[PDB]
Amino acid sequence: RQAITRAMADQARTIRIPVHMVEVINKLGRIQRELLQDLGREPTPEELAKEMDITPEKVLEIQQYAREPISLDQTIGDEGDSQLGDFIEDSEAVVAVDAVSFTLLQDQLQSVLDTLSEREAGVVRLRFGLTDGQPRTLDEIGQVYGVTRERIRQIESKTMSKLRHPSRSQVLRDYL
Amino acid sequence: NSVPGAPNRVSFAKLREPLEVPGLLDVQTDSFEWLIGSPRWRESAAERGDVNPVGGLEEVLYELSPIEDFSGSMSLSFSDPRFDDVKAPVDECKDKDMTYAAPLFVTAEFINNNTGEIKSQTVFMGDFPMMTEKGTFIINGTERVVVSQLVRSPGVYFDETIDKSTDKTLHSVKVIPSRGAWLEFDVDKRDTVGVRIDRKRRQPVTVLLKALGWTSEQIVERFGFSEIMRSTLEKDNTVGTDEALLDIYRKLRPGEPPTKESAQTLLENLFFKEKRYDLARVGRYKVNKKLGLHVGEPITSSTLTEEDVVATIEYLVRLHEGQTTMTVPGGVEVPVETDDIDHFGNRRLRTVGELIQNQIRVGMSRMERVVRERMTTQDVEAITPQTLINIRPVVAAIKEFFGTSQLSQFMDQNNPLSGLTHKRRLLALGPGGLSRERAGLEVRDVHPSHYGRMCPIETPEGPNIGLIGSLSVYARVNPFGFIETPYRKVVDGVVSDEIVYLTADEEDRHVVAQANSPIDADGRFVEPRVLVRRKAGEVEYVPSSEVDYMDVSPRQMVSVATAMIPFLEHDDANRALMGANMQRQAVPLVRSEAPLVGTGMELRAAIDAGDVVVAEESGVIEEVSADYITVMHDNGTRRTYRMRKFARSNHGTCANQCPIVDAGDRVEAGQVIADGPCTDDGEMALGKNLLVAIMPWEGHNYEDAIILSNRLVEEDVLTSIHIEEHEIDARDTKLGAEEITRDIPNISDEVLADLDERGIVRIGAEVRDGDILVGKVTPKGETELTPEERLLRAIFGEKAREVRDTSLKVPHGESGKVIGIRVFSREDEDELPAGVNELVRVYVAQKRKISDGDKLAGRHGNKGVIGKILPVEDMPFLADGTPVDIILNTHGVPRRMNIGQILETHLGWCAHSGWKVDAAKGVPDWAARLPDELLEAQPNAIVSTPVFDGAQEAELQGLLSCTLPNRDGDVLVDADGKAMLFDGRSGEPFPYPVTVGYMYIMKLHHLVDDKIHARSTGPYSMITQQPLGGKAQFGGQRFGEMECWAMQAYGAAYTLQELLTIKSDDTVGRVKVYEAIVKGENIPEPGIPESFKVLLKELQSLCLNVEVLSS
Amino acid sequence: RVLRGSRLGAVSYETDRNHDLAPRQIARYRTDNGEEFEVPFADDAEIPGTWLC
Amino acid sequence: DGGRFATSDLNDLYRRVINRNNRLKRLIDLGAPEIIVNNEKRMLQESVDALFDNGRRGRPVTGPGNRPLKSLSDLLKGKQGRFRQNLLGKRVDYSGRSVIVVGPQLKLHQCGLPKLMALELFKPFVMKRLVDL
Amino acid sequence: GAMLDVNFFDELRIGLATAEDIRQWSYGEVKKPETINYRTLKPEKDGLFCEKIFGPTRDWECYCGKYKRVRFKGIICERCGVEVTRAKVRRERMGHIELAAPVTHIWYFKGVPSRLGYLLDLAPKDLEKIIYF
Ligand SMILES: C/C(=C\[C@H](C)CCCCC(=O)O)[C@@H]1O[C@@H]2C=C[C@@H]1OC(=O)\C=C/C=C\C=C\[C@H]1O[C@@H]3C[C@H]1O[C@@H](/C=C/C[C@H]1O[C@H](C[C@H](O)[C@H]1C)[C@@H](O)[C@@H](O)/C=C/CC/C=C/C2)[C@@H]3C
Ligand SMILES: [Zn+2]
């Protein structure tokens, strides 16, 4: 009976739950069926948390663990050919206007960096890693530039003051 | 008449019918209070005898009472189910989404056989969803209606076919019980028998005859005078009593050693004990009427008996020979006949009480199994019925029926007529019956006993034709679940006023005359040869002595909704079908004006639909208001009547209740005090009365299109109200908890200027598409950003805004003011779903004007969308200056055979302008049978033509002769019915006069913004990569198979490739298509579709090497 | 009305540079039945001598 | 929403095959009577058979509500299979639907269109044009 | 014949897949019936969603989160064991289950005629008494 209960705790759910949480789920379910029977009405979870001497938020987390998932292969619609798995909005998919917006933003930003000088563009590009994917620091930029990192910070403050013209960057204010 | 607040609707009704229309929702209410065992039902059933009337709950309990253990050591009874009050009132349950329940209390009692004690607890059985006043149920706030269902009654059905090969008419019989197994007595292709039982693949009569224990000579004195009995007595091939017992038993078991003594009793178990096999009291009455055995004794013995069994096989072999009538040894004779299932004597109606009783039965069985299970496991002197009984599967069965069944349904309530006709529907085949795809058209046809018992006109017009027929008007359900129909009995030619309610059986015992039959005004006919309905479903002429029953009235065979289509006897059945389906699809207008021409059914149909608040007790108004009516009764007491102003129905439409009485008004009992949605002055009103010309106008009314004047748009004549509900919830999550607030990231205060200080929009805020209703923000978490995003943030100084805005936005197209803010909170300690901290519902309402495309219809199925709303100046106007409102098409009238609408148009003009026929000769000849106080009429006076006794051609044209002028001396409409129209557009008079009049049309619930639906790029599916269709989303169009065929047939390869790759499934292709469009560059080449790669991966996963070769 | 879902994973939108990568070693692995496997580790990466191939 | 997970009914079959194979490997490395070993192999065989086609042999493996698990062959055969559905046709972008009315002044190569719908259809074209202007 | 999807084939040769081809296609033996951890909602190790087997769920993200950008590409994190790439190759890469005891495909066994019994000239019931033990 130990091996049977161990197997029913291990391999009886689509998501694996370690056996102690299955045990407290079964204790909660036993207490809940007993309370719905003998109370007559449905128990409140705060009363259940008093009953199992635990906190109601832990009771809610255990109930959240208790919900077994449903399948996607049930004929949920009124039509038998209608599938439940079709009617799911893929909220983690390509929104496809923001991608081309992002590409156009990249090109306009390249134009804006083209409107400035060479040292400025190199400093901002190597600073935020826009040209490669690696944000280097001011010490690396002064290493590749042969000047102090404090000079890089002064160049940084100059470029950020240069960027913060709304007359220059209304086209980038539009991009947010 | 006979209703105090009825409007003075004059009628053409020549026939005077003595029977009044019944209490239309009695089919729901009597069934449910039979299930309760209401005291009202108790005395009502004690009226018609029935010395032991039993509520259905008491029936299920007394069936289950008592429950033994296995060893006989103890017993558990059940006794007296009783109720408490309701848990909550109606609108409170509807608001808080609670089911309108009531507790069940049961005097349970346990008794030990060992020592002997009573254990008389009072077990609370469950909260029970009580029926409302209007015969409906409320489940989770929504209004739910259980529908009456038709099934074959349990009994013995002798049905025979003749084979195509040997031409031998083989005779089968299905003894189908309630709840049990199917034993049969068929006949094989030889001269043997098909007593093959519950599909046990071989059985003759003899093995059961000696499994009965009888001998071959005992077969001979039972089956004796047939080649069937000789050939089966020689084709027994298993002789011996207990030999046939063990033969039956080894056919029953196969897979185990048998035992002979169990073979004698398992036969008595599976058919003759009343513990697992019980055809009901209904089917037992059916059998005892079929064979005439239990004629002098009341209904009992719900299992089988061997006398009836051998009588059934004797009936089988005698109809196999062909006999006229059979008396059994021990029974009066009954006519030997076939059995047609479609006859209503064989089709019982399982109403809502029978359905709930079946679900209580299966719940009690599934808890009784646990009771018997734990009975042995529990120790003595330590138990009680509270320790024994699990009511959790019982309440699970009740809730699993009321939610998520087929028979439970949302109350289709866009108007009170659709409420009334979503009640009183009969579903012919479904759960507990045949499937829709399995059923042919023998169910779909109309058996000739449907006359008065089910309306042949009203049905869905889709694939479900004839499966869903409504109840008739005067029909009444039997205690046995049969459909009684009232009849005036005629004795010696004198038709009495003894109304007798008749089932289909006593319909077939007799012959029945018609209401259109000239009585002597003293009871007798004036002609000896009368139309009659022969009991074989035929029509004859008969001497006027032999008829014993007459119809109560005309319109007995028609539905409730179909009883409201005037001039029905001129219309065709197809267009009447479309009109009767079109009646219960109107939307309630803001004015809700009564039709100028109707039947006598509008008034009673309104006040019985429940959607009009009735003056309950006769009193005087103490105070009127807009929300309540304080009546003052004649003895001290007072009562308010809270109006439900702007309640949302189940289809978005409004449900206002404007009061109709004033301050000093004295009302009577059963008087209308407040019109509902589609009611005027008490009676029903599904639309407005409208001027109409029947000319074809400029191709805008082409192929059943309608045009309208702009006067409807400007004067708000056709204007519904659509209260739409939006609802969002504040849950918790893994990253924290969602919250509702004013703070939305990366957003301006301009869009935020309408919502309140805590996030919701205030009452009265006008919204548009894409506005915010509930400002809701969830914890996004913290992710790494793109460097360009980081650089823009560093330029503008803004933070990451680490919480994701997923706020409720009002979706596309919907607009209007915000009426109500229904908001709930878990912190406010209401009951809420698991994890939801706040639930907020927002009601938005738009006052939709009429528009081009809105599906309009008449009352005869003469439907059509609005083609073009013309301005009122270039609309063809009547010669006094009145512009007509709508202009139909002529060519849709004759070839659809619905000139009921033309007769209605003429009568509408007559009743609009008013008339006064001449009295110089008194009564002109056409006006003879025309009833009095109709020879004159004031203008704008309503009239009522009943269904099959109404206006006639001669009366209509003679009344259209004198049609008193408007204000001047101007008879605008000739005796032909037409009128001369000047063209509002050109200016010339139209060279031929045109039929005009006042048709009564409605506006249907098929409006354009419910349907207009477009998508460029929206959400996608999850597993497949297709654009997710459906108007709830942005939604594509299903480019189906035949469209692929057609675009193949054009040879357009490229457009097909676009439609199947880069508008559908090419994932990287779609963004490149979008990029090429907004960059203005050429559309790139379509790549491989995603669904094909899905197929490739599945076929690789099925251990199939799908090599795809290039060269 | 519409029920939505999200497969629990992050989706970015960048440029697939086949030129500007972190350079990397390749470690050849030999299993128990002599099977060769070439796991690409990074350059700056400790190579475990054992590896579930 | 609310964390309601949705499986795909093949994970249960895969879990059963994985579990039975692991158990069989454990019993083989342990040493067991051959009735047990052959019984586990038979269970593995029935599991694989139902994973490819549920209900092809014996009784179909079902789940909650006794609904049979949509196995691998079920994705191909039947009306819900890949072949019939892919032949049935897909929903498309840049589409839309509406009710129709008569157009008795239009020319023959012409159809009316509501601006509220044609705005939704031609959104990328109209975006490109009004960002060029 | 190349599966590199260049939209020109003119040929499509179905055929039986050998056990060598099945173990050739895969990316490691999935060996645990654990799909998603109940607490962290991340895929379990060597289970039916294991990112080392199939691929990462987050774009160019190793599972432990050491390497996280597209500069690290085509490599495998030595700690977490997940090759860094896009998320859409999780649609693509198959895994295999190794078996302790062999298995007969039901598509060659429950057919009319059973191709196994027709290759070995045996009854169907011979097969249902052999590979059901
Ligand atoms: C096909 C069908 C129902 C269809 C959805 C609509 C019926 C045909 C309507 C028509 O064309 O006239 C059957 O429904 C059930 C049994 C078998 C079928 O089940 C089926 O195949 C389909 C559904 C079975 C149970 C559905 C339960 C819940 O689904 C929602 C909520 C619950 O019930 C549904 C309620 C539908 C009410 C309809 O009412 C009709 C108008 C609209 O079509 C609907 C508003 C009215 O014409 C009304 O008078 C007719 C009611 C049908 C009578 C009894 C039906 C029981 C609503 C859609
Ligand atoms: Zn990692």
PDB file of N, CA, C and O and ligand atoms in Angstrom, chain E residues 61-67 77 79-82, ligand 2:
ATOM      1  N   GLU E  61      18.104  32.469 -24.989  1.00  0.00           N
ATOM      2  CA  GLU E  61      18.310  32.468 -23.549  1.00  0.00           C
ATOM      3  C   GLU E  61      18.638  31.065 -23.081  1.00  0.00           C
ATOM      4  O   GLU E  61      17.818  30.156 -23.225  1.00  0.00           O
ATOM      5  N   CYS E  62      19.823  30.893 -22.508  1.00  0.00           N
ATOM      6  CA  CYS E  62      20.134  29.633 -21.859  1.00  0.00           C
ATOM      7  C   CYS E  62      19.317  29.499 -20.580  1.00  0.00           C
ATOM      8  O   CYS E  62      18.804  30.479 -20.034  1.00  0.00           O
ATOM      9  N   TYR E  63      19.190  28.258 -20.110  1.00  0.00           N
ATOM     10  CA  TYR E  63      18.201  27.954 -19.081  1.00  0.00           C
ATOM     11  C   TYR E  63      18.607  28.511 -17.729  1.00  0.00           C
ATOM     12  O   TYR E  63      17.771  29.042 -16.992  1.00  0.00           O
ATOM     13  N   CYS E  64      19.886  28.410 -17.389  1.00  0.00           N
ATOM     14  CA  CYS E  64      20.360  29.004 -16.153  1.00  0.00           C
ATOM     15  C   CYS E  64      20.459  30.512 -16.264  1.00  0.00           C
ATOM     16  O   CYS E  64      20.546  31.193 -15.239  1.00  0.00           O
ATOM     17  N   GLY E  65      20.441  31.048 -17.475  1.00  0.00           N
ATOM     18  CA  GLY E  65      20.480  32.472 -17.666  1.00  0.00           C
ATOM     19  C   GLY E  65      21.861  33.072 -17.712  1.00  0.00           C
ATOM     20  O   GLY E  65      21.989  34.289 -17.551  1.00  0.00           O
ATOM     21  N   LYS E  66      22.901  32.264 -17.915  1.00  0.00           N
ATOM     22  CA  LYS E  66      24.245  32.819 -17.994  1.00  0.00           C
ATOM     23  C   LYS E  66      24.432  33.587 -19.292  1.00  0.00           C
ATOM     24  O   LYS E  66      24.624  34.807 -19.286  1.00  0.00           O
ATOM     25  N   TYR E  67      24.353  32.895 -20.415  1.00  0.00           N
ATOM     26  CA  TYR E  67      24.373  33.541 -21.714  1.00  0.00           C
ATOM     27  C   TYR E  67      22.953  33.955 -22.053  1.00  0.00           C
ATOM     28  O   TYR E  67      22.015  33.180 -21.858  1.00  0.00           O
ATOM     29  N   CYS E  77      25.435  26.378 -23.304  1.00  0.00           N
ATOM     30  CA  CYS E  77      25.864  26.709 -21.957  1.00  0.00           C
ATOM     31  C   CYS E  77      26.337  25.456 -21.241  1.00  0.00           C
ATOM     32  O   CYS E  77      25.617  24.460 -21.168  1.00  0.00           O
ATOM     33  N   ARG E  79      26.813  24.996 -18.138  1.00  0.00           N
ATOM     34  CA  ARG E  79      26.078  24.719 -16.915  1.00  0.00           C
ATOM     35  C   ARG E  79      24.699  24.166 -17.227  1.00  0.00           C
ATOM     36  O   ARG E  79      24.377  23.028 -16.877  1.00  0.00           O
ATOM     37  N   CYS E  80      23.876  24.960 -17.902  1.00  0.00           N
ATOM     38  CA  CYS E  80      22.488  24.584 -18.085  1.00  0.00           C
ATOM     39  C   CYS E  80      22.288  23.576 -19.200  1.00  0.00           C
ATOM     40  O   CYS E  80      21.247  22.917 -19.239  1.00  0.00           O
ATOM     41  N   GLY E  81      23.244  23.443 -20.110  1.00  0.00           N
ATOM     42  CA  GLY E  81      23.127  22.403 -21.106  1.00  0.00           C
ATOM     43  C   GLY E  81      22.170  22.681 -22.237  1.00  0.00           C
ATOM     44  O   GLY E  81      21.920  21.784 -23.043  1.00  0.00           O
ATOM     45  N   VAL E  82      21.624  23.885 -22.334  1.00  0.00           N
ATOM     46  CA  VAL E  82      20.703  24.230 -23.406  1.00  0.00           C
ATOM     47  C   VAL E  82      21.453  25.002 -24.471  1.00  0.00           C
ATOM     48  O   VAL E  82      22.110  26.006 -24.175  1.00  0.00           O
TER      49      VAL E  82
HETATM   50 ZN    ZN F   2      21.617  28.286 -18.742  1.00  0.00          ZN
END
